[PDB]
Amino acid sequence: ISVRGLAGVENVTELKKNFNRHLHFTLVKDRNVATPRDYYFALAHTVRDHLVGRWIRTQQHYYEKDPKRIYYLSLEFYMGRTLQNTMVNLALENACDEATYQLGLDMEELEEIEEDAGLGNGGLGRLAACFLDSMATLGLAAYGYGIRYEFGIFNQKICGGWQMEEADDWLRYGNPWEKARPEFTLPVHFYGRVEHTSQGAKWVDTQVVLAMPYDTPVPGYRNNVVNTMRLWSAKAPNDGYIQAVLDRNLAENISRVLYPNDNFFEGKELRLKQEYFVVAATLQDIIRRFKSSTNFDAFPDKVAIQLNDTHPSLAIPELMRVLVDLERLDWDKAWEVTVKTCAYTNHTVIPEALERWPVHLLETLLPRHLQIIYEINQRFLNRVAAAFPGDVDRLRRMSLVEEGAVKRINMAHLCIAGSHAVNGVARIHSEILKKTIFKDFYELEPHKFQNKTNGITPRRWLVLCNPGLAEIIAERIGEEYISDLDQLRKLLSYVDDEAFIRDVAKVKQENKLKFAAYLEREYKVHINPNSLFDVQVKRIHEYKRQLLNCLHVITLYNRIKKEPNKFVVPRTVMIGGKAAPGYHMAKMIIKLITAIGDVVNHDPVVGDRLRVIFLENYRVSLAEKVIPAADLSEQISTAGTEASGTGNMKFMLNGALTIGTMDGANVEMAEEAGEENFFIFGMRVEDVDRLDQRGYNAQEYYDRIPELRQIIEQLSSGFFSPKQPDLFKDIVNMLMHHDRFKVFADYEEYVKCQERVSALYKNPREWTRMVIRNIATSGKFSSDRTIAQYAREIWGVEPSRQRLPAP
Amino acid sequence: ISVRGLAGVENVTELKKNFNRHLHFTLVKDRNVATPRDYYFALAHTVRDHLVGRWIRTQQHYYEKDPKRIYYLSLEFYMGRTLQNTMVNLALENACDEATYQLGLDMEELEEIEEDAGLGNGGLGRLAACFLDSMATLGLAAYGYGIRYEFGIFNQKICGGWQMEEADDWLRYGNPWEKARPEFTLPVHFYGRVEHTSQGAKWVDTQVVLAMPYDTPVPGYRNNVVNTMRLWSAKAPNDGYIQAVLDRNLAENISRVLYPNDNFFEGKELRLKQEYFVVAATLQDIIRRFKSSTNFDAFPDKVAIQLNDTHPSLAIPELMRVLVDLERLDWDKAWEVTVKTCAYTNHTVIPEALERWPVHLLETLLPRHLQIIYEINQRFLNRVAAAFPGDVDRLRRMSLVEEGAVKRINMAHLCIAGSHAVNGVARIHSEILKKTIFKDFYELEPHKFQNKTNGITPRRWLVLCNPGLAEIIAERIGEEYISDLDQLRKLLSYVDDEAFIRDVAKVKQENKLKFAAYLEREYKVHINPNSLFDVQVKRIHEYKRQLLNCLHVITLYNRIKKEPNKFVVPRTVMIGGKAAPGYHMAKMIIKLITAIGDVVNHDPVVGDRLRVIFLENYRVSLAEKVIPAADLSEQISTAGTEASGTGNMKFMLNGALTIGTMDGANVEMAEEAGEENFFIFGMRVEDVDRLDQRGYNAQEYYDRIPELRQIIEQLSSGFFSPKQPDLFKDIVNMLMHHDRFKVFADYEEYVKCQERVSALYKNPREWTRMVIRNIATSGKFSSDRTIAQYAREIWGVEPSRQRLPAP
Ligand SMILES: O=C(NC(=O)c1ccccc1)N[C@@H]1O[C@H](CO)[C@@H](O)[C@H](O)[C@H]1O
Ligand SMILES: O=C(NC(=O)c1ccccc1)N[C@@H]1O[C@H](CO)[C@@H](O)[C@H](O)[C@H]1O
Ligand SMILES: O=C(NC(=O)c1ccccc1)N[C@@H]1O[C@H](CO)[C@@H](O)[C@H](O)[C@H]1O
Ligand SMILES: O=C(NC(=O)c1ccccc1)N[C@@H]1O[C@H](CO)[C@@H](O)[C@H](O)[C@H]1O
Ligand SMILES: *Cc1c(COP(=O)(O)O)cnc(C)c1O
Ligand SMILES: *Cc1c(COP(=O)(O)O)cnc(C)c1O
C-alpha cells in the first residue's frame, strides 16, 4: 500500500484489541454509542501507548550517559496534529491503517478529527516544531521549553469578506498527547523590591505564581528516541473569601492566550510576564537537572540554551541573578558561564518588530533584572570604549539602553552581548545583519556572528502530507532519503525518464483533484483541477506583498475582458493567511482579495479561466493539504525583508515551481536548483537601496504604466466595491504615498515573469522536467541539515543516527 | 483478615498486573521514580476499571426497562474519598489489600493520599451523598445532579487560635473518578428580555453560558448496579482581542467555588446564577432523556424530581417555562405536570437561613421566570381566597411575594405551591413545620406534608470506617445486616454475653489508640487514650451550642482547681468544625475553644485529667477517624432548632453514648434505644416556648448559679485572654443580653447530666452494655430505610435488592 511500514499479522491483531480496550475502559463507550470522535481517541490512545516505553528509556539513557543537554527556548511551538506524525516516526501507519480497516473504520476520516496544536503564529513557531523533530531524529538530548496556552492562534472566519477572530479552544475535548506533571511545579516571582544587605542583593516581597509543567513526547524518525517538549501552565498558590478565590484567575491569565501580533511590537505587560514566566521556570528546571548530572565551571559543557528570537532574552539576566544572587558566584565568573551557554537567533530586520521594553515596566515587574541589565550594559560599553577610544557615537548606538521619549531596553543588544553566538536564518539575511543592523557589534566581536539557513522536516512535509510523491521517489532511490534528504539528488538521473516524468506529473494531478474536492466538501466552491494552481499562503504582511499578487490578478482579469476570445492558461489563484487582529492594513488586504474574487468569480466572460480563492483559516493542517496540490509557489517579498521563509522550501519539496524575488532562502534555493529552473524577478537588495537613496516615487510608475494606472483607478472608483465606492482608499493612498515596500517598482517585472510561467505550463513535459530538477535539489533545506550545523558549530555536540536499543 | 471480601489467587494476580500496567502506561513511571501518590493513582485506576463494565450495563438496563427515573437535585454533594468505598461495594478490599501487600505497599497509606471531594458544607451535602449510595444499593434508576466546583469547602487552618480559610484545590492532581462528557454540553441563558408575540412569550437577547457535564459512578453495595452523579461545569462559548478571551473567565466563575455560608442568607447574584445554572442544564437533560424513553401526560409517571432544600427551586418555574413557552402546553396542563413531578425537602426552621430573593435580582437575571412566578402566585392566592373567604391576612402570609423594604420572592412558598410533597427530616421537625412555619399551607393542603427521618449509609459509616466493629458483629449475626441494618436488633441477645461485651469494648479501645496516635503523627499533641473521649464535631453555629460545651469544660477545670486531690473521671474533650467565613460569632467561639485549651492543657495541677482539643479541618475523611474513636457524642442544640442531625446517628452506630436534648432525630434515637440508655437533658420544645412567652432573662441564671457567675467573670476579666483582657466581650455580651439560644437556661441540667455520664464511665461493664443496646437499636437510622420511604411514599417506585446480571 506504500512504505508506511509493514502491516504484520500479529501487530494488526494486537492493535485491534488495544483499540477496543481503550474504547471500553478509557472512553467508557461501546460500539453502539461511539462517535467518530471517540474512535479517534481510541486510536490516539492505542498509538500513544507505543511511545511510553521508548520515552522512559530515552530519558533514562540520558541520565546514565549524561550528555550535553540542548534547551530550545521559544514562546511558540506550532505543532499541528500529532497522530499521523507519531505513526510515521514509529512505522505504525500501515498497521493502524489495516487494523482500523478491519474494525470497519476509515483512518483518514479519524485523523481529520484531531485538533491542531496551534501554539504559534507562523514561521518562527513552526521552525521550533521542525527543529524538535530533527533533534530527536539526530539523537540529541534536547528539550523544547515553552508555554502551554489554553488558547492558541485564533481561528479565522471570513464574514462578508472580512476576517473575524474566534477563540481556538483546542483543549476542549482534551489533549491525549500531553502528560501533566504537578510533582514538578516550580514557583516564579514578580514585582517586589531589591534589598542590598551585607552579603549581596536580595529580591523580596515578590508576588508568587506557580508553573506547572506538561510534557509532550517528541519521537525521532524510526530510531526509538523520544525527547520531551515541556510546556508550562500558570497556577495560583492556594495561600471577601469568594472574591479571593475568584481572583486566582489573574495569576493564571499568564498562560491563557498566545499573542497573535505578527508585525508590530506592542509592549504589553501581560506579554512581558509570559516571557519571564517561561524563562524563570525553565532555568530552575535546567539548573536542578544540572545539579544531579558545585562547580558551575562545567555548566557550559553540560548545558546549551538556544534563544528563539529575543522573546526568551530574560534568560540572560535571570541566569546571572541565580548565579550571582543565589549561588554566590562572582560576577565575572558568572558572566563567563552565561555567555558560554547562551546563543541567540534573529528572525527579522524590520524595526517595528524589535522588542524594546520601557524601563518603567521592567522597573516595576522585575527590579533586580533591571539592575543586572544596567550592570551588563556598563561593562559592555566599557569594552567598546576600550576598543574604539573616542568613538562617542558608537557608544550610544551600541548601548542596551535607548534614550529618548521613554527609556527602553533593546533586547537584541542584550542578546548579542550575552551570547557566544548570534545567527541569521538565511545567507543573505545573516549578511545583512553584519552589514547593517548589527554592524557595530560585528566589528567588536566578528567571531560571534554565524548563519544557519532554515530548513523543514521531510517527515511531516513530504512523507506525511505527500505519500504518493514519497512512494514514487522511494521506488527509484530507496527510503534512506527520508533521514538524508541530500539523496534526492539521485533523482536528477531520471529527469529524462519517461516513466518518472509521467509519475511525478500523476501524483500532482491526484493531489490537485483531492484538494479540489476538499474545497467543495468543506467549503463548497468548485474549482477547475485542470487550471494552474497559483498559491500564496503565509501570514498577511505588507512586506510579503500579497498586494503585488492582487495587482497581477486584476491585470489578468483586465486582459481577459479586453480580448475575451484570446486563449490564456487557466489559473486558480489561491491566497490564504491570517492577519494580526490589530493590523488594519492587513485586514484591508484580506477584504480586497475577497472583493476581487466577487467580481472575477462571477463574470460570465471569464468562465473557468480565472478563479480567485481566499483560503480560510490557513494553519499547519491546511498547509499539509494545499502545498502538495500547488503548481506555482508565490514568494514575492521585497528584497531584503523576508529573513528566510520556510513555506518556500515546503513547496519546492512537493513539486511546485517558484516565482519569487532574490530574498531570504529563495536565493539559496535558486542557487541549488539553478536559476534557469527558477522564476526570479524584481529588484535585488542593492536595487532597493539605490531606489532609497534616490527616493521612491510611486507616481512615476503610475504615470508610465497604463495597465497599472487602470488598476489603481478601478480601486479608486469603486469598481471592486460598488456599495462602498471609497472602501479601498486607504490601500490606494498607501500604494501611492507611503509604500515602504515598493509594490509598484516590481510590478512590471512580476507580470512579465508570470507570462513566462504560463508559457512553460503550456508544455507539460518540460514543466514536469523542471519540477524534477527542483525536487531533486531540495535536499539542502531539510531541518536535519540545519540542526546538524547548530549542533556542530554552536552547541558543541555530535549528531548520531544510531538507533536506540529497541523499545 | 475480615469480611472485606475474598482474596482469590487469580483475582490477586490479575490486580497486580493491572497495577503495573497503569503505573507504566497511565502514569508513565517505573518503580524507581514512583512516589506514593503515583502508587495511589495506579491503584485508583485499577479499581476504577472494575466499574466500567457494570456502569455501561446498568445504564443500558435502564434504557431497555425504561423505569421511572429519580432526579435528586442538590447544590451540594459531600462525597469524601471514593477509593475504599468503591472497593467495599465491589467486594475488592481484601484482594487489593493482598495485591498491594505483595507489591510491597501499604494500602492504608495509599488511601490517605486521596483528596476529599468536599463539594458540600455539612449535613445537607452529606445527606445527598448517603442518599446516592442507598439509591444505588436499592436498585433505583437514580441520578444525582449538581455543580462541579473547582474549589470545594475551604481547608481550615488554625493560626494563633483563629480560623484561616485556604482554597481547597482538590482537582490539582486530577480526579480519576470523574469522566468528562463534552459531547453533552448544553446551553444555559441569563438576562435578556421577554417578548410577547402572537403565539406566546419569548425570552430573547440572552447571554449564553455552556454547561459541560462530568459523570461520576455511584456503585450499589455488591449488587452490580452503578448509577450516575452528573456535575455541571461552566464553559464560555468561543464566539481588545486579548481582553475578549481573558474575559471568558467571567462566565466560568459560575462553577468556580462552593458558597461556604452555613447560617445567614446573603443573596448574592453569583449564587443565584449557580442555582439557575444547575437547574437549567439538568432539566434539558431530563426532558431529552424523556423524549427518548409528545404527550407530557406521562411525564410524572416517568420522572421524579427531588429538590434538596430551596436551592434548586427555580426548577419549578423553569419546568413551566419549557412546557408552556417551548412545548406550547396550556398553563393548567403544564402546572398539573409540574406539581406531580416535583417534591421539596426542608432542612431548617430558622428564619435567617430562608432564601428570599430580591425581585430586582430576578427581574434582571431571569425576567421570564419572574413573570411565571407572579402568575403562579396569582393562581395560588386565588385558591386560598376561595378556601378561606375574607381571610385577608392569610392572603398576605401565604403569598410567594413578600412586601416591605424590598420585594422578595419566598422560595419556600414557591416550593410548597409547586410540589406534590413537602417533608421534614425528623418527626419533631416535620411536626413543627405543620404547627408553625407552614401552618397556613398545611391547612390548605394537609395531604402534601410528610416526614422522612434522615439516615446514614452503613457501608461508609460502619463497614468502611469501623471494620473491627463490623467484624465482631458479623461474627455473631452474619453479614446480611450491612444492607438490612434492622438486623442489628439481634445483637440485643448478646447484651449479657461476656465475650461480646469484651469484644465491643476491645474494638473501641483499639480505635481510640489509633486516633490518639494519628493525633500525634499528623498534629503532634498527645492525649491519654485511657480518658473518656468527649467529642462534638459539626459546623460551628450558635444554635448547636458549642458554647454550652465550653461552659461545662470551664466548670470541670474550675472544680479541679478547687479540689485538686479529688478523683475525677479523666476526659479528653474534642471539639471540631468549620465556621462560615463571615460568621463573626462562630469565629469568636473557635477562638474561645483554643483559648480554653491553652489554659487547661498547660496547668500542672490538672495533669492528664482534662484535655481540651480543637480538631482542625473537620471534614468527611476526619469524621471517619474520630467518630469510631468517640465515647461521648455531644448533640446539644436548643430544642426545636436542629431539624434532624446525622452526626448523631453516626456516633450511635459506632459505639458511643449520646448526651443531648430532645431535638431533631435525638428524639427518635432515644425512643429506639430507650430513654434509660440515653443521656437526655434540658428544655423540650414546649419549655422553650414557655420561656419565650415569659421572656428569657440570662441575668436570672447568672444571679442564681455561682458556678456560672464565676465562669462569666473569668471570661470578662481576661482569665482566658491575658494579653487581650476584653477579647471575649462580644461572647459575654451576647450570652447576657441577646442569646436567642438560651445557653444559660440549660446549663444546670447539662452539668448534672454530665456527672451521670462520668459515673457510668467508671463502670466499664455497664457502660459497654448500654453501648450494645444503642448499636443494637440503630437500625432505623440507615439511609436505606429513608430512601425506601421516599421511594414508596413520594416517588412511586419500588426498591429492589436484586443483583444485576453480573459484570
Ligand atoms: O495525560 C496523560 N498522558 C499520558 O499518559 C501519555 C502517555 C504517553 C505519551 C503521551 C501522554 N495521562 C493521564 O495521567 C493522569 C494522571 O496520572 C491519569 O489520571 C489519566 O487517566 C491519564 O490518562
Ligand atoms: O514568524 C516570525 N515571527 C513571528 O511569528 C513573530 C511572533 C511574535 C512577535 C514577533 C514576530 N518570523 C519568521 O521566522 C521564520 C523562521 O526563522 C523565517 O523563515 C521568516 O522569514 C520570519 O519572518
Ligand atoms: O477521565 C476519565 N475517566 C474514566 O475513564 C473513568 C472510568 C470508570 C469510572 C470513572 C471514570 N477518562 C479519561 O477520558 C479522556 C477522554 O476520553 C482520556 O483522554 C483520558 O486518557 C481518560 O483517562
Ligand atoms: O446542612 C444544612 N444546611 C446547609 O449546609 C446550608 C447550605 C447552604 C445554605 C444554607 C444552609 N442543613 C442540615 O441538613 C441535615 C440533613 O437534612 C439536617 O440533619 C441538619 O439538622 C440540618 O441543619
Ligand atoms: C510553513 C508555515 C508558515 C511559514 O510560511 P512563510 O511563507 O515562510 O511565511 C506559516 N504558517 C504555516 C501554517 C506554515 O505551515
Ligand atoms: C455527618 C457530617 C456532618 C453533619 O453533622 P451534624 O452533627 O448533623 O451537624 C457535618 N460534617 C461532616 C464532615 C459530616 O460527616
Side-chain angles (χ1 to χ4, degrees), chain B residues 78 122-123 126 461 537-538 544 618-620 623 635 642 645-647 650:
Chain B
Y78 211 160
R126 181 59 229 181
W461 301 113
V537 289
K538 62 245 268 101
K544 309 239 200 219
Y618 180 61
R619 52 193 192 288
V620 177
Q635 311 292 336
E642 189 73 87
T646 50
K650 298 168 205 180

Side-chain angles (χ1 to χ4, degrees), chain B residues 557 594-603 606 719-722:
Chain B
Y557 171 75
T594 64
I596 286 161
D598 284 355
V599 172
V600 175
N601 303 343
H602 300 110
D603 195 325
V606 172
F719 181 87
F720 290 103
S721 49

Side-chain angles (χ1 to χ4, degrees), chain A residues 137-340:
Chain A
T137 290
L138 293 184
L140 296 170
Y143 304 78
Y145 273 102
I147 295 176
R148 174 184 186 267
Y149 306 105
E150 22 192 289
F151 293 101
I153 183 66
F154 65 83
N155 277 319
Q156 183 194 54
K157 286 242 191 112
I158 299 305
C159 210
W162 301 94
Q163 155 171 304
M164 298 295 313
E165 295 90 26
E166 166 165 304
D168 163 49
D169 196 9
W170 74 295
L171 298 165
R172 171 136 287 144
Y173 300 83
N175 181 14
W177 306 112
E178 70 189 6
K179 169 77 228 248
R181 303 251 131 167
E183 58 263 39
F184 300 111
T185 293
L186 260 18
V188 173
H189 304 259
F190 290 98
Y191 305 102
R193 72 205 156 69
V194 183
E195 251 177 27
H196 288 287
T197 72
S198 4
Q199 243 45 226
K202 252 187 15 258
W203 192 11
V204 304
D205 306 353
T206 61
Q207 169 202 117
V208 172
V209 181
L210 302 171
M212 170 172 302
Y214 281 78
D215 292 353
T216 295
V218 182
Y221 181 72
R222 269 108 130 145
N223 65 161
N224 295 320
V225 162
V226 175
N227 281 342
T228 304
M229 176 184 55
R230 174 160 285 183
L231 265 20
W232 304 103
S233 201
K235 261 289 218 189
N238 325 276
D239 79 311
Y241 160 82
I242 298 294
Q243 243 332 121
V245 328
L246 293 188
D247 279 354
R248 292 183 118 242
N249 287 311
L250 276 41
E252 313 186 339
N253 272 347
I254 287 166
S255 60
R256 190 87 64 214
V257 56
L258 163 87
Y259 266 89
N261 204 326
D262 228 0
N263 76 316
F264 203 53
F265 165 74
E266 275 189 274
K268 304 306 233 249
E269 189 198 36
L270 182 53
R271 167 80 167 188
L272 182 49
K273 276 166 161 180
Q274 291 189 328
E275 286 177 4
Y276 183 57
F277 179 69
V278 66
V279 162
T282 300
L283 276 183
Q284 288 179 68
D285 222 20
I286 288 171
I287 291 175
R288 165 183 18 187
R289 196 176 286 120
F290 169 69
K291 298 218 160 166
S292 301
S293 247
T294 335
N295 254 143
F296 282 82
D297 289 296
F299 193 72
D301 286 325
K302 289 295 179 194
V303 176
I305 292 160
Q306 191 66 38
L307 314 168
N308 200 14
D309 214 310
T310 66
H311 311 157
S313 74
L314 283 169
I316 286 151
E318 169 70 9
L319 182 48
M320 281 297 283
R321 189 186 68 81
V322 169
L323 287 181
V324 169
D325 286 357
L326 315 187
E327 298 296 344
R328 307 242 100 91
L329 262 73
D330 74 276
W331 185 276
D332 295 301
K333 224 284 116 169
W335 185 245
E336 203 201 322
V337 171
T338 295
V339 175
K340 266 160 102 195

Side-chain angles (χ1 to χ4, degrees), chain B residues 2-4 88 133-134 137-138 221-222 456-492 494 500 507 652-654 775-785 801 803:
Chain B
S2 231
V3 138
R4 293 175 150 214
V88 170
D133 175 272
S134 282
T137 290
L138 293 184
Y221 181 72
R222 269 108 130 145
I456 58 173
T457 174
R459 273 123 267 159
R460 178 167 227 107
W461 301 113
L462 177 50
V463 180
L464 203 147
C465 62
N466 209 346
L469 178 67
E471 184 55 13
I472 67 166
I473 292 171
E475 260 171 40
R476 330 267 173 158
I477 64 166
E479 290 171 44
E480 244 270 62
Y481 77 87
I482 290 151
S483 48
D484 193 6
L485 216 58
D486 282 310
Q487 298 210 11
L488 243 32
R489 282 208 166 294
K490 296 198 246 187
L491 285 189
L492 249 16
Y494 292 89
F500 199 62
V507 308
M652 187 185 192
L653 186 59
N654 280 274
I775 295 169
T777 57
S778 57
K780 182 199 178 163
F781 306 107
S782 148
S783 41
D784 289 350
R785 185 267 312 153
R801 279 259 61 212
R803 244 108 268 137

Side-chain angles (χ1 to χ4, degrees), chain A residues 548 701 704-705 743-753:
Chain A
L548 179 62
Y701 298 88
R704 337 243 248 221
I705 312 151
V743 171
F744 286 2
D746 274 341
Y747 174 81
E748 263 197 326
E749 254 203 76
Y750 178 55
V751 171
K752 280 174 198 197
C753 186

Side-chain angles (χ1 to χ4, degrees), chain A residues 14 27 38 59 129 134 265 275 282 328 339 365 419 421 449 453 490 520 550 575 621 648 679-680 682 719 725 803:
Chain A
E14 188 77 357
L27 279 4
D38 296 310
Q59 287 319 306
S134 282
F265 165 74
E275 286 177 4
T282 300
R328 307 242 100 91
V339 175
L365 199 73
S419 304
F449 300 78
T453 299
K490 296 198 246 187
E520 271 186 317
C550 285
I575 302 176
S621 72
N648 46 187
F679 288 98
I680 303 292
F719 181 87
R803 244 108 268 137

Side-chain angles (χ1 to χ4, degrees), chain B residues 729-742:
Chain B
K729 60 156 206 244
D730 286 345
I731 294 174
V732 170
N733 208 95
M734 185 268 286
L735 256 353
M736 303 285 302
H737 315 298
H738 358 96
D739 186 359
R740 315 166 49 202
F741 305 106
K742 320 168 165 42

